[PDB]
Design a protein around this ligand. Structure first.
Ligand SMILES: Nc1ncnc2c1ncn2[C@@H]1O[C@H](COP(=O)(O)OP(=O)(O)OP(=O)(O)O)[C@@H](O)[C@H]1O
Ligand SMILES: [Ca+2]
Ligand SMILES: [Ca+2]
Ligand SMILES: [Ca+2]
Length: 342
DNA sequence: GGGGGAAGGACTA
DNA sequence: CATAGTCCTTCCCCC
């Protein structure tokens, strides 16, 4: 199998650079201003000019400002990035039918039937990079290998504006030399737990009692790392299997005023439909988190399929039913979609 | 056997 | 609640 992975480089910040070219070359830091007080919140993504000085994903905005007081700090514009992202995903759609959109900034293409080998996979990666740069002026990094995991690792290694193939032999080498912390889906907490079991490489998970490994990190992650270590990993590039897809936004002030709530609910729906993409729900649940943090929800099933605009109007009715049946103010409001058609 | 929902955990998917 | 959101983990009801 030949898998080609694409990640859009320092995406939120790059998009901002594209919408305002004067920012290029200067440190740029997109942040999620949490609203608790001036500069509360954490950095979402920073460009490389900012990473040079340690400003990066997840550190407090207040700290970023101490290290780089004169950088350009911008608020998160999730909607803008989703729109720019969907267009890029549409371009990727031209290169393969088997595509798996993983998040707003990345996707996997199974190109097993479009190319005969890595040399051709590589030329295709350059084509793709050139297409996106041409259409949207956004640089991306391509990772190519025998499965999803190694294709992503290659992009992580080659970024930004890069391309890299990890052939079968290097896969065998990496299974032995790759810090476990660098494996997709594996974060710090799990990394630390394994360090403590004296595990630092994929290969290491092959010399420990499965039940001892499972006991520390869960069955799913234990099988996972193991199937990789045995170069036995092979999961299809399939549209992800999801129970429900939703979004819950925290409002600025608790409320029970139908008109005041609406906007937030709609932003929730908007975002939700962007995340649903081709998937079509039959069920919609409106979800409210009350002032005292209780969860209240009212849903409805539609034998046909729920269009975005129908979700807009049917949710409002569900929201009204909630207000009539619970007199508490609402703090957070959102929606959930489930039971998809095939 | 596994869908799928509740509530807390871990990853940036 | 106390960086937010997304997705994962564990457990239990239920088909
Ligand atoms: N600790 C964090 N807190 C909040 N948001 C985070 C955190 N880490 C990552 N993110 C968000 O997740 C997205 C991805 O960031 P991450 O640093 O993993 O990106 P990456 O795709 O590997 O890419 P790049 O080098 O292009 O920025 C964005 C932001
Ligand atoms: Ca990225
Ligand atoms: Ca990414
Ligand atoms: Ca990452």
């Amino acid at each position: 199998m030949i898998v080609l992975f694409v990640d859009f480089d320092y995406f939120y910040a790059q998009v901002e650079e594209v919408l305002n070219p004067s920012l290029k070359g200067k440190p740029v830091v997109v942040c999620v201003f949490s609203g608790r007080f001036e500069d509360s919140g954490a950095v979402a993504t920073a460009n490389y000019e900012a990473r040079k000085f340690g400003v990066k994903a997840g550190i407090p905005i207040v700290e970023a400002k101490k290290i780089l007081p004169n950088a350009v700090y911008l608020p998160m514009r999730k909607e803008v990035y989703q729109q720019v992202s969907s267009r890029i995903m549409n371009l990727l759609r031209e290169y393969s039918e088997k595509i798996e959109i993983a998040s707003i900034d990345e996707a996997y293409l199974d190109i097993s039937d479009k190319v005969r080998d890595y040399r051709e996979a590589y030329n295709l990666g350059l084509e793709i990079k050139n297409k996106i740069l041409e259409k949207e002026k956004i640089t991306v990094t391509v990772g190519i290998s025998k499965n999803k995991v190694f294709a992503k690792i290659a992009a992580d290694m080659a970024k930004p504006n890069g391309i890299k193939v990890i052939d079968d032999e290097e896969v065998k080498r990496l299974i032995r030399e790759l810090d476990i912390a660098d494996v997709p889906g594996i974060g710090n907490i799990t990394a630390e737990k394994l360090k403590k079991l004296g595990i630092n490489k994929l290969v290491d998970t092959l010399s420990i009692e499965f039940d001892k490994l499972k006991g520390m990190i869960g069955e799913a992650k234990a099988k996972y790392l193991i199937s990789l270590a045995r170069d036995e990993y092979n999961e299809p590039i399939r549209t992800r299997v999801r129970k429900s897809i939703g979004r819950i936004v925290t409002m600025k002030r608790n409320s029970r005023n139908l008109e005041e709530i609406k906007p937030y609910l709609f932003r929730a729906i908007e975002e939700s439909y962007y995340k649903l993409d081709k998937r079509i729900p039959k069920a919609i649940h409106v979800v409210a988190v009350t002032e005292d943090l209780d969860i209240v929800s009212r849903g409805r099933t539609f034998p046909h399929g729920i269009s975005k605009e129908t979700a807009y109007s049917e949710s409002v009715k569900l929201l009204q039913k909630i207000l009539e049946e619970d007199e508490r103010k609402i703090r957070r409001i959102g929606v959930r979609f489930s039971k998809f058609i095939e």
